[PDB]
Symmetry: C5
Subunit: 346 residues, 5 copies
C-alpha cells in the first residue's frame, strides 16, 4: 500500500473532509486536552511588567472523521504539511504581548494520528506574557506569574479546554533562573471569560517565583550599614574639631542620597512605598539626626564650667545610644518581614 494516497483517502475532496468544520458539528463539545513543556524561562523585566518563556505546547483531541484502520500501524507520525488542512483549535494566550513560531530549518510542528481517531498536535512557541506584579516587600517578595490558554472563536458548547491528570506543566531539567526560584508545585485554576459576545473556555496556570536577596544585601544594605557606622564615628571625634565632624555628617548624607536614588534603578515608578524605601529612609533619618546632634552640642558648648561637661555628656550617651536604637530597629525590621513574607505563601 502506497503512503501518499492514504492521506488523500483519509482526508480531502474524495472523502469530503473539511478543515473548516469541527469534528462533532452538532453534537457534544470538542474536549481538547492541553499540556506544556517549559523549554526555557527568563528575561523577566520588572519595568515592562512581563516575562519571556519558550514552551512546547501539546494538544490532544478526538476527530471521528480521521479514524483509520487500513494501515496496521497504531500511530501515524505525519509531517506538518497537512496541518493547515485539518481542523485545529483556535487557542490563544490572553496575557500575551508578543509571540512567534520557530522555523530555524523547517516548521517546528509535530502531528500524530492514532487508530481511534485521536490527534496529537505539538508545537514550539516563544511568548512574552504580561505579568501584573506587586513590588511591595521588594527585596523579599514572592511573585506570581500568569498564563491563560483561551479559545477565540468557539464557545462552551463547541470547545472545552482541559488538563491531564498527569503532569500538565513539565519543566526542563537543569533550568535555573538567575534572580528567582521556580517552585516545584503549580496551581491550575479554571478561568472562564465572559464577554458581551458570549462565553468562552479558558485554562490558567500559576508560577510562584521567589526573588534572591543576596544581591541586594551586597548592594544597598551592607554599604548603608557601613555608612551609618561611619557616621557613628563622629561621636568619638573631638567635639572641638568642627570641620572634621561636619565633614563626617555631610559626606555621609551626600553619599546616602545618591544611594537612595540609585536603589530604585530597575523598579518601575510605583506610588506605594517599598521595604527598601523604609530601610533607607530610617537610615537617612539616623545619619541626619547624628549631624543634628552635632548641631546641638556645638550650640550648647558656647554659652559664655557646667556647659562643658554637659556638652561631653551628649557625646558619651550617644556613643551607647545610637547603636542600641539601631539594633532595635534591625530587630523590628528583620522580624516583621520574615513573619509576613512567610505569610501569604500563595
Amino acid at each position: 500500500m502506497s503512503p501518499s494516497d492514504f492521506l488523500d483517502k483519509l482526508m480531502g475532496r474524495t472523502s469530503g473532509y473539511d478543515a473548516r468544520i469541527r469534528p462533532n458539528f452538532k453534537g457534544p463539545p470538542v474536549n481538547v486536552t492541553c499540556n506544556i513543556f517549559i523549554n526555557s524561562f527568563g528575561s523577566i523585566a520588572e519595568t515592562t511588567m512581563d516575562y519571556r518563556v519558550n514552551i512546547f505546547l501539546r494538544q490532544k483531541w478526538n476527530d471521528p472523521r480521521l479514524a483509520y484502520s487500513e494501515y496496521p500501524d497504531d500511530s501515524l507520525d505525519l509531517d506538518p504539511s497537512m496541518l493547515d488542512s485539518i481542523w485545529k483549535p483556535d487557542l490563544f494566550f490572553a496575557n500575551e504581548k508578543g509571540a512567534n513560531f520557530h522555523e530555524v530549518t523547517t516548521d517546528n510542528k509535530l502531528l500524530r494520528i492514532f487508530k481511534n481517531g485521536n490527534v496529537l498536535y505539538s508545537i514550539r512557541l516563544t511568548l512574552t506574557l504580561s505579568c501584573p506584579m506587586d513590588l511591595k516587600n521588594f527585596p523579599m517578595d514572592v511573585q506570581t506569574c500568569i498564563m491563560q490558554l483561551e479559545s477565540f472563536g468557539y464557545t462552551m458548547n463547541d470547545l472545552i479546554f482541559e488538563w491531564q491528570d498527569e503532569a500538565p506543566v513539565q519543566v526542563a531539567e537543569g533550568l535555573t533562573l538567575p534572580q528567582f526560584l521556580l517552585k516545584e508545585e503549580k496551581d491550575l485554576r479554571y478561568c472562564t471569560k465572559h464577554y458581551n459576545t458570549g462565553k468562552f473556555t479558558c485554562i490558567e496556570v500559576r508560577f510562584h517565583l521567589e526573588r534572591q536577596m543576596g544581591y541586594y544585601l551586597i548592594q544597598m544594605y551592607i554599604p548603608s550599614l557601613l555608612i551609618v557606622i561611619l557616621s557613628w564615628v563622629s561621636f568619638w571625634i573631638n567635639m572641638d574639631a568642627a570641620p572634621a565632624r561636619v565633614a563626617l555628617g555631610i559626606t555621609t548624607v551626600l553619599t546616602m542620597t545618591t544611594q537612595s536614588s540609585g536603589s530604585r534603578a530597575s523598579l518601575p515608578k510605583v506610588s506605594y512605598v517599598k521595604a527598601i524605601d523604609i530601610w533607607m529612609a530610617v537610615c537617612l533619618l539616623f545619619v541626619f539626626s547624628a549631624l543634628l546632634e552635632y548641631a546641638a552640642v556645638n550650640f550648647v558648648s558656647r554659652q559664655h564650667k557646667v556647659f562643658i561637661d554637659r556638652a561631653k555628656k551628649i557625646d558619651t550617651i550617644s556613643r551607647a545610644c545610637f547603636p542600641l536604637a539601631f539594633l532595635i530597629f534591625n530587630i523590628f525590621y528583620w522580624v516583621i518581614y520574615k513573619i509576613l513574607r512567610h505569610e501569604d505563601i500563595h
Copy 2:
C-alpha cells in the same frame, strides 16, 4: 444538509457575491457600528510621546446579500477562512505609529453571520498610538490619550462609523496601570477628516489618565527638603568656623545641581518650564542665598565691638526667617497647584 456547500451557495461565483463591492452599492451608506475591549494597557513612554494598547475590535454591519434562511440556526459562527472573501470596512487608526495582528496558534479573528444578514467581525489588535502630551504641571498632571477610527477609501456617502448605546469602550477587569489611573468615564467625540481628496468618516475616544505623585515626593521633594533643612544647619554652626560653614554651603549646592539635572531623566526636552523646575529652582535659590548670607556675615565680622553683635544678629534672625520664608513658599506652591490642577478636569 452539508455544512461545506452552504458557504458556496451563500457566497461565491455561483451566487455572484463579490468581496470588492460594498453591500448597498448605489443606495444609503453602510453604517458600521464599532466597539472595543481593552485587553491590556501600558508602556506609556513620555520620551517617544506614545503608548501601547492591546484591544479587541468588534465591528457590526448589515449585508443584504449574506441573508440566509436555509439553516435553522439563528447565528452562523464561521472560521476566518472566508474573511478574505467577504466585504470588510477599511478601518484604520489615524494616530497609530505601529500595529500588528496576532497569529500565536491560528488567526485571531471571529466572524458571525445572522439570519437578517448582519455580520459580526471581531479581531485582536496591538497598537502603538501616538499621544500629544502636555508636560506642564509634570508631577501632578491629568493627561488625555487619543484614539481615532477612520475609513481610508470610502467617503461619507459610502461608509459611516458609529458606536452603540451600550458600552462602546469596555476595559478588562483588574487592569491596573503602574504610574497612572484610568478614569471610569470616557468621552466619545465625532471627528471628521477633511482632506483634499474629500470627506471621510471618523470616530474618536478620549482616555483621561492621572499620574501618581508618590514616586516623585519620595525622589525629588523629600530629599530636596532634607537638603534645604541641612543648609539651615549652618545658622546654628559657629560663625567663626569658616571651613565648616562653607562646606555646608558648597556641598549642598553640589548635590542640588545633580538633583536638578537628574529630575528630568525621562522627560523629553520641553521649552516650557515645569512645576518641578519651579520647585527645585526656588530651593536652589534658598540654599544659594544661605551661602551668600554667610558671605555677608563673614565680611561684616572683619571691619577693624558693635560689629560682633551685628554679625550675630543676622544669624539669630535667619534662624527664624528662612524656615518662615520657606513655609510660606510651601503654602504658595501646594495650594496654587491643588486649585488649578483640580480645574480643567477635561
Copy 3:
C-alpha cells in the same frame, strides 16, 4: 450593469491591458504629479542623524488605456485589490534608512479612476529618513531636513515627477513638535540624479526646523552662571582662611568638569567645536583663574607691612573686575550669536 465585470473589460486579458507596460510606451514621458500630507512628525535622533515621519503620499497620472465611458459615474473609487495589476510608478526615497507600509486592518491604499483616464493613487507610509545635520551653534541652530522622491527604473524619457501649483506639502493641523518649530514655508528644489546607468528624475522638499533654547538655559547656562557667581564668593571670604577659599575653588571646578562632560550627552561626537563648548570653556577658565588668583594672593601674603595691603588690593580689585569681565563676555556671546544665527535664514 454589473460592477464586477466592468473591471474585467476595462483591464485584463480580454482588453489586453498589461501592468508591465507604461501608458505611453513609445511616446512622451509619463508625467506623475505627487504631493504629501505629513500625518505625524517626530523622533528626530541627533545621534543616529535621522528622523521619523508618517506621510500620506498621493500620486496622479494619466493612463489612456484606463479611459472609460460606460459607467456614468465621473469617478471610480476602487479598492486596492487591483493595485497590483495596474501600472504604478517605481517611486523611492533616496535618503530613507527604513520604511514600511500599514496593514492595521486592511491595506492602507486608495485608488480612483476618472473618465478621462486619470488615476489617483494614495498610500500611507512610515519613513526613517537620514538627515545630514550641522551641529555648530548647537543650542541655537536652524536645521534643514531633506526628502527626495526619485524613480528607480525609468529615466527622463519615461517618467517625470512634478508638484502641483496647489499645496504640494500639507501638514496636519495641531501637529506640534517637542523640541523644534516647523516653518510654515517650504522649499521645493528639483534634484536630478546622474549615475553611470543614466539620468533619473527626482523631486526634493526642504523642512526648516528651529531648536528651542529654553531647556538648555535651564540646564547648562543658568547652573553654570550660578557656579561662576558662587566662585565669585571667594573674594568676599577672609584671605587668611585657606581651607575655605580652596574649597570654594576646587569644588567649583569639581562640579564644572562634570557639567562640561554632561552637556554633550545626546550630541554625536563631532570634531568641530560648538557654542556650548565655547560657553563652558570660558566659564571654566573664569573659575580656574579665580582659584589661580587665590594661589597668587596666598603666596604674596607670605614674604617675611606693605605686603598685607597689597594682598588685600587684589581681592578688592577682583571683587569689581571678575563680574565686569564676565558681563563683557556675556555681551560678546549673546550678541554675536543673535546676529549670525539670524543670518543664513536658509
Copy 4:
C-alpha cells in the same frame, strides 16, 4: 540530453517521489551526518544569558529514490528551487531563542546529489543561543557555551544524527573574539531528549571560552589598589590635623562605594558572591579600618605625657602593618584563584 526534464524524471508525479515520506519508510532509520562552520562569533551578552553565532550547517544523508545514472556527472549541483520538494530532516536547535535565514540576494542554500543517491544540503543560519552561565570567579572564569541539534518530529527508529570522523566543527580563520578566547579543542557529547511524546535524537557541542582579565585589572583592581595606598597616606600625616586625616578617610570610602557599585554594571544580578565582590569588600574593610584607626588614636590622644607617645606608637606600627596585612591578602587572593581556576579545565 536536456537539463530541465531530468529533474522531472528523477522526482515528481511521473516518478512517484513524495517529499512527505522519508527515504527508508519501513526500514532502518535514516542516518543524517551533520557538521558546522562558524562564520562569525560574538555578541555574548551576560545580562541576557545568550550569545550570537552565524554558522554554515551542512547535512548529508542517503536517499535511494534519488539515485541516478543517466547523467555521467558524478555530482549534481542543484539550485535551491526544489529544496522545498525533497525530503529534509526537521533539525532544530533546542537552546535557540531567535534565528533566521539569509536572503541578501537569493536563498542562501546549497544542494548536491551524487550518483549513489547521497544528498549534501548546506545552509546559512544566524542563531541567538541561550547559555546558562556561572559567574562565580567572575574576572577569571572559563565559561562553556552549548549547542544542541535535535529532531522535532522523528524518533530514534526514524532519524539519527551523527558527526563525521573529520572535523565536525570548523572555525573560520582569523576569527578573534573581543573579550574571550575560543579553545582549539571541542567536546562532542551525545544528548538524547526523553519527553512524554517519546524518544528523540540529539547531538551536542561544547565551546570553552576564557575571559580576558586585562580590562578588569585596569578598571577595578589597579584604581582600588591606588585608593588603598592613598588611604595609607593618613598614617604619615600629622596626627593633630583632624580635618586632613578625616578627609583622607571619608573621601576614600566615598569613592570606594561608587566603585563597588559600578563594578557590577554588566553582571546580571546573582545571589552568589563573586571574586570581585570579595576583593572590593576586603579593600573596603581595609580603608574603613584605617579611618577607624584614626577614630581610635584621636580619642586616645585626649585623656587629660604617656598618652602622647602611645598615640604616636599606633601610627608608627600601622605604617608597617597595613601594607604587610594587605600584601598577605594579595598572596592569599592571587594564589587561591590561580590554583582553583586552573582546576576544572572542563
Copy 5:
C-alpha cells in the same frame, strides 16, 4: 509588434528558457562583473564591531539565450516582474550580520537586456557588515572596514566575480561621516574561499577610515591637563595648611578616577591597553605623586632649624620640576604617536 508577447517568445515554455540553468551550462564559467554605489554610510558601532551601509549593487553578465534582434531598440528596460524567472547569480556578503531589501513603493530593482544578450541587474540593499576592529591607538587610529562578495552555490568552473576597469566603488557626492574620514582611494583584493565543499569565487573591497581626534581632546585630554595643572597649585599653597593641600590632592584623584573610568564608555572591553589608558595612567601617577610629595614634606617638617628650609626646598624644586617632567612626557607622547600612526598607512 506587441510589447507583451515579446517577453514570452524571448523566455518561457515556448522558447524553452529555464531560470534554474546557468547560461553556459557545460562551457566556460559565467563572468559576472559587479560594482557598487554607496548611497549612505554610518552607524559604525564599536561595541557591536560592525557598521551599516546602504548600497546600489549592479551586476552585469552575458546570457546567450536572452539575445534578441526583433525589437530595434538597443536596450530593453524591463520591470522586475520577470526578475524571478531569469537566471541570477547567488551573490552573498560573507561578513554580513543583517540585511534586507527595500519595498517602499515597489520593488527597488532594475533590469536591462541588450541586443548582444548582456544583462544589467541593479538592486538596492541595506547591510550591517561586521568589522574586526583593532582599538590600539584609540584616539588616533586608522581603521579598515571590509566587504566581501562571494558566490554560495557555484564554484570556480561556473561563476567568476570581477570588477570593471572603471570605478568599481562609487560614493555619493556630499556624503560626510560624523566621526571618521573616508579615504578617496580604495583597495580591491581578490579573496577566494576554500571550504571542504570546494572552491568558491570572492571579491573584496577595503575602506580606510580615520577617526577625528577633536572630540577626545575636548573631553579627556584638556580637562585632564587642567586637573594636573590644578594639582600643581598645591606647591604654591602654604606648606603648613594641611587641610587645604590634602583637599587639593584628594579631590584631584577623586575626579581623575571617574574620568579614567568614563573615558572607556563606548569602547568594547579589550584586553590590550590603549593610548588613552597610557595618557590617563601617567597623569594619575603625576597627581598621586604630587600628593605623596606632600606626604613627604609634612613628615619632614616635624622632626623635633635645618628641617624647615629643607621642607621649603622640596616645594621650590617641585614648582619647576613637575611641569618640566610633564612637558617631557608630552613630547614623548605627542611625537611617538604622530610617527607610528603615520606609519602603517595601509
